[PDB]
Amino acid sequence: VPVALVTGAAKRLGRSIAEGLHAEGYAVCLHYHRSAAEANALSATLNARRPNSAITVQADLSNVATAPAPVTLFTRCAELVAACYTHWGRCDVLVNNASSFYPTPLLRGDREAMETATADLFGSNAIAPYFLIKAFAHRVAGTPAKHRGTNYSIINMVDAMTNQPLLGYTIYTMAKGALEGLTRSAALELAPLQIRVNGVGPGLSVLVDDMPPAVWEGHRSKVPLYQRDSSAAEVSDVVIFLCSSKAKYITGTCVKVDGGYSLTRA
Amino acid sequence: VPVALVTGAAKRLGRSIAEGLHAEGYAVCLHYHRSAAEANALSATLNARRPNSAITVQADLSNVATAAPVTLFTRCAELVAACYTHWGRCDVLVNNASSFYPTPLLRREAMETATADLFGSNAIAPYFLIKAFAHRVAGTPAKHRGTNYSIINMVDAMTNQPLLGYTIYTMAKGALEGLTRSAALELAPLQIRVNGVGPGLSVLVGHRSKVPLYQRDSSAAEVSDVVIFLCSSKAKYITGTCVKVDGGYSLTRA
Amino acid sequence: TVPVALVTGAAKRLGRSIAEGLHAEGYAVCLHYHRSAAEANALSATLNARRPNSAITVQADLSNVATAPAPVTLFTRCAELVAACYTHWGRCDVLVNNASSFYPTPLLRREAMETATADLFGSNAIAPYFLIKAFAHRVAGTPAKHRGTNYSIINMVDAMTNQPLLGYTIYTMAKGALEGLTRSAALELAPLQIRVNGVGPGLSVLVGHRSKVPLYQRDSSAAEVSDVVIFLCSSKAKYITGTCVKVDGGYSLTRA
Amino acid sequence: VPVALVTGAAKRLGRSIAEGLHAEGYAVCLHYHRSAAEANALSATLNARRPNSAITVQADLSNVATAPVAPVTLFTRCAELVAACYTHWGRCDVLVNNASSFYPTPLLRNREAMETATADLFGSNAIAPYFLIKAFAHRVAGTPAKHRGTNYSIINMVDAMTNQPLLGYTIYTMAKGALEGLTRSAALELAPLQIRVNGVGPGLSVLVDDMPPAVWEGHRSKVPLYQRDSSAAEVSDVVIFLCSSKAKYITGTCVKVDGGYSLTRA
């Protein structure tokens, strides 16, 4: 029974990914930060379909120390991987999906929305993924060859549109650039242990409708294929395929799931 | 029952792709140039597992006239037509056929045939085939159209790090990548997806020890399986992108 | 010592600004043209007036077709272009593949399909290939002691081809081939110290669309592009090779 | 008389860049961290060539708070660097993010180390550049249009080889990917103020030889053009050109100065 750890698994794409892996027979460690209710509701459904196929772990992946001596981001990340080994004795798949997304304009007490944004955006999107990968790799390396899984796979959720940045989202964009970098570096270094590291880059998926309907139809109509944002499955299915043994030769690459959005120009 | 046209389907990757699509329920038009025996043997196997699930069509995809003189465009249209004539539809196109040999820049008509052969098979033919494919979908009344039109271009994961002496081939692959993006954008309104699959080193005829993952060339399946997935309805949101199937080779340096 | 530059499609717009730019650096210039005979000759006169014997003009169709005398092939025509530089000045230091046909070839909605393909693919890709091969043979054939010290080939590419212009498939394909040529030629010709780079304009000297460019909200001047070509040719850029420089004012960073 | 701020200007490429800009008529603020002697020696030479054409500011660009005389954050330290240009000369026209730590952070084959490394590598190569750009931009924005310079230019020192990562240098590679991201995001957002943001990516320049001669030669004989590492001028001259008014249409692009190294494969 293979195990998958999905960060930010409570809802939207993270939920669809977790559900997708679960349908392939995976036991799933659903990580969450604030969405406790939703995470627990998802665990219940999965555990109902298949007894002992889901657990829930809470963690702030922001680059800050947590409350008692203080706990570092690294420790918190190691604990996430450990929870998989403690409960099921293994961890075969890692999906770095958790991600903060809000503006940090280069143009205009207060240093709160200053230092906290950097650590939140950079930690969730890049530093935490880094530590999680190290921890994941360490556990594989420590396992005697005779007891290793046969299909280790790490998926990093990136962004198909960062080459054409969203105005005002500099740190987020910077953070995603770092994640792409991690994908290539990790793929190369972990190749001898047969651990594949790839990336999935959504364009517009399950677009949040907290705006005037027309403005919302304005965004989705810019996508050349279907003139709409994608469903969560349209993205999660790709993540699932990259984790399958049929994709065992793919590593170090980023797959755009954007319906041709990146091919547009103003 | 959906139809797939695979150029250069007789052996190696082309064969594995055809076999892969066939296992998903597709009727397959196996294209070939010189490999007549191999192509016919493959059709027999597929037709034996499922009656009327395979045919074979011969064509030179080089940018020249043949058999008054028949142009490359006509030959390409005939390939697509053969699918409509036999089965009444064509849902998938896989531009896999490709010549691959050196054209050194440093030491007559031997290059004249090389240019048209390498550029035709790898880029010009694919262009005409897509055009023919798109014309046929457009001409079909909306109510009768298939629900999963997909075109796959076989590109190269290593062309950003060129193989010494293979300029025309490398140029041709660059054109094919360009075709993938342009076609994806123009055919989007008809729900025709256009993507690319880029192998690194697959089923070699030394250097394979330098592939970071497994330290070997890939099997044909390790590549064909990706082409199959991109054709599945699960991948319906993917278009205009190239997927590397190279085991991390493109991440290396000298 | 006066170095020589061959600039294809040098009669007007960017090609002319490139030729003028190289000429102001002391280069003797071979202005190639196809149909623009009058402009090419007027440009030669100006350059030859400023500096005697610093310009010549040569005519050639760079389309992938055979012309009548055994028909003259595109390769031969390209070799002749490079030869004209050696015949007149005894050297060829810089090659700028600038000539380019640009019109739609829609996928949706006969003689023109065959002539469009060879015209767009030849001018934008096959001619540049043959020209580079011819340029390289001549350098290779020249005894080491006699070789120039700054061999540079510039390919005019396109900053926006990753975000294709709707309906321009063959042109877009041709530019992709040219980028491929830039990398392949840079690698193979490195032992001979011949550098091969690319310059990719976005919107330059156009004949509401330009208001979409992030920088200045306008199309560029010819100089704003040619000056980059000139710098990449300078000895100060002797370590750059196999790279494409976008000169687009951030246009490629936009999205619909 | 235009002003240029060059971080990590004390030696090698940073020096060559400062010297390059100085020869074009620029007044130069030379930043340094631990190379005080070399920085002061460089200031002396430049000031001897042209009185009052050079100053020096010390700063740790690592993502950590320092000890004042309430700690001082990285952001404040960055604002102070830009401020020093305005205080001394009343202007700042060019910013060159050159300062950079570069050492291994392995994923495998293995505390205080895995803490300070992250902030040092990520701060110097990405977080500091972000804050510096932000500070530079408010400064231009706060200047009345009539008093603005006519050629604002920011150059970020990136890496031509990060798409083919150096084994074991994950954080560094991740940091460079963030920097590329910053170059595109800033270019787009600062375009209305006519501030250009570009990248220059060296391959092998002035290679360190703390290794056997053969190993050093090996690395050098892999560069296709000349079979050698570049001189500092071969790189700095490109930075200087991108800053010239002749390059006023270039923005958001990265220029490789690698002699074809990125075109190679194993």
Ligand SMILES: NC(=O)C1=CN([C@@H]2O[C@H](COP(=O)(O)OP(=O)(O)OC[C@H]3O[C@@H](n4cnc5c(N)ncnc54)[C@H](OP(=O)(O)O)[C@@H]3O)[C@@H](O)[C@H]2O)C=CC1
């Ligand atoms: N959807 C889209 O249009 C696009 C998505 N992507 C990428 O795809 C992935 C998934 O997309 P989507 O579903 O929209 O993502 P969401 O924006 O919904 O965020 C996913 C989860 O990340 C968690 N999270 C946020 N910050 C932190 C943090 N500080 N520490 C720990 N967890 C945190 C949250 O969990 P919780 O609720 O428990 O707090 C949140 O539900 C993301 O990585 C995103 O970057 C990229 C481009 C476009």
Ligand SMILES: NC(=O)C1=CN([C@@H]2O[C@H](COP(=O)(O)OP(=O)(O)OC[C@H]3O[C@@H](n4cnc5c(N)ncnc54)[C@H](OP(=O)(O)O)[C@@H]3O)[C@@H](O)[C@H]2O)C=CC1
């Ligand atoms: N295998 C690899 O390591 C790599 C492969 N690729 C790409 O993957 C694809 C498949 O790879 P692979 O199986 O090795 O390909 P092959 O080299 O075996 O060629 C495929 C087929 O193309 C057909 N073909 C060649 N020239 C022509 C022509 N002038 N007109 C019509 N058909 C022609 C041949 O068919 P016939 O026998 O009937 O004449 C041949 O069997 C190719 O497109 C290739 O470019 C890219 C990088 C690496």
Ligand SMILES: NC(=O)C1=CN([C@@H]2O[C@H](COP(=O)(O)OP(=O)(O)OC[C@H]3O[C@@H](n4cnc5c(N)ncnc54)[C@H](OP(=O)(O)O)[C@@H]3O)[C@@H](O)[C@H]2O)C=CC1
């Ligand atoms: N300007 C722009 O906005 C952009 C330009 N570019 C590229 O920059 C380069 C220069 O741009 P621009 O000045 O606008 O180019 P032009 O469109 O003005 O064309 C340049 C010249 O190419 C020559 N030419 C065209 N077809 C042929 C052919 N069949 N055989 C021989 N010569 C031919 C013509 O010469 P003649 O008059 O003598 O017949 C023409 O004057 C081109 O390569 C273009 O692709 C790329 C993106 C944008």
Ligand SMILES: NC(=O)C1=CN([C@@H]2O[C@H](COP(=O)(O)OP(=O)(O)OC[C@H]3O[C@@H](n4cnc5c(N)ncnc54)[C@H](OP(=O)(O)O)[C@@H]3O)[C@@H](O)[C@H]2O)C=CC1
């Ligand atoms: N040289 C090469 O082969 C390559 C260089 N590059 C990039 O080019 C740029 C310049 O190259 P190079 O001259 O080799 O750079 P160096 O390795 O010599 O470093 C440049 C300077 O950065 C400063 N620095 C390092 N860490 C910090 C920090 N924590 N806070 C403040 N300053 C710091 C140091 O200044 P001080 O001495 O005062 O402490 C150092 O002298 C760099 O950004 C590098 O990443 C990229 C690829 C290859």
Ligand SMILES: COc1cc(Cc2cnc(N)nc2N)cc(OC)c1OC
């Ligand atoms: C194209 O414009 C927008 C696109 C998106 C999509 C998006 C992009 N990235 C991430 N991480 N999440 C998203 N929802 C989100 C937006 O903001 C809600 C946009 O408007 C500024």
Ligand SMILES: COc1cc(Cc2cnc(N)nc2N)cc(OC)c1OC
């Ligand atoms: C290819 O291997 C190496 C390459 C480099 C180049 C290099 C790469 N990045 C930076 N910032 N500086 C450099 N000198 C530097 C090295 O030294 C640590 C290498 O290891 C021997």
